[model samples]
Target: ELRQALMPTLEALYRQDPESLPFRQPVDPQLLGIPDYFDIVKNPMDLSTIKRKLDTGQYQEPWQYVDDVWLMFNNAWLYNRKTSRVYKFCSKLAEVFEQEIDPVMQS
Candidate 1:
């Protein structure tokens, strides 16, 4: 459900032909799932444990960062419906991205 983002070329249509954009997305779906990679939502814990699970490959699904499957994670980050302590985690994600990747991030 998290397949929303902007491209550089769209910046032109966004500014010059803004009327082309839809007022609202018509494909909205029901509550999306946040994959419990480390079983950390209900059982919140320290970052070390999160890292441990990541390091040991203790996740549920075989997530090789596939774009389609990753939509859940991306959507959760984009629009948290108060599910699975998402507000907490997305902030951390934003922090890490800001630190390691782009300061001009969309988060």
Candidate 2:
């Protein structure tokens, strides 16, 4: 199968990316109602969606096209899911995001 495309891109580990750390701020699991009694956590998008719902009622939080949620979800974990072996070598990279952010949040 062949198709014409204007833009096609692939992603890989970017542990060295300058902004990766600045973007992946630690998120509170409780605030997210996490460890989903009914489900498990793999994608940050799934978690963020829950956040939008829990945040308010009668008002759906709109994630603007340029919102932080989208980027953080994609950058911190989404791309890793696509890589070979799925976070095989990327485990440390993901931890970096988790660790760096945790201390900041704690402070």
C-alpha TM-scores of all predictions:
0.24, 0.25
Instruction: For candidate 1, write residues 1-107 as lDDT tens digits.
Output: 11112122122222322232221121123333435433433323332333344456554332321222233335444454556465455444434433432322334
lDDT on C-alpha atoms for all candidate structures = 0.33, 0.35
In model 1, the Cα lDDT at residue 41 comes to 31
Error of 1 at 48 (Å): 19
CA RMSD of all predictions:
16.0, 14.7
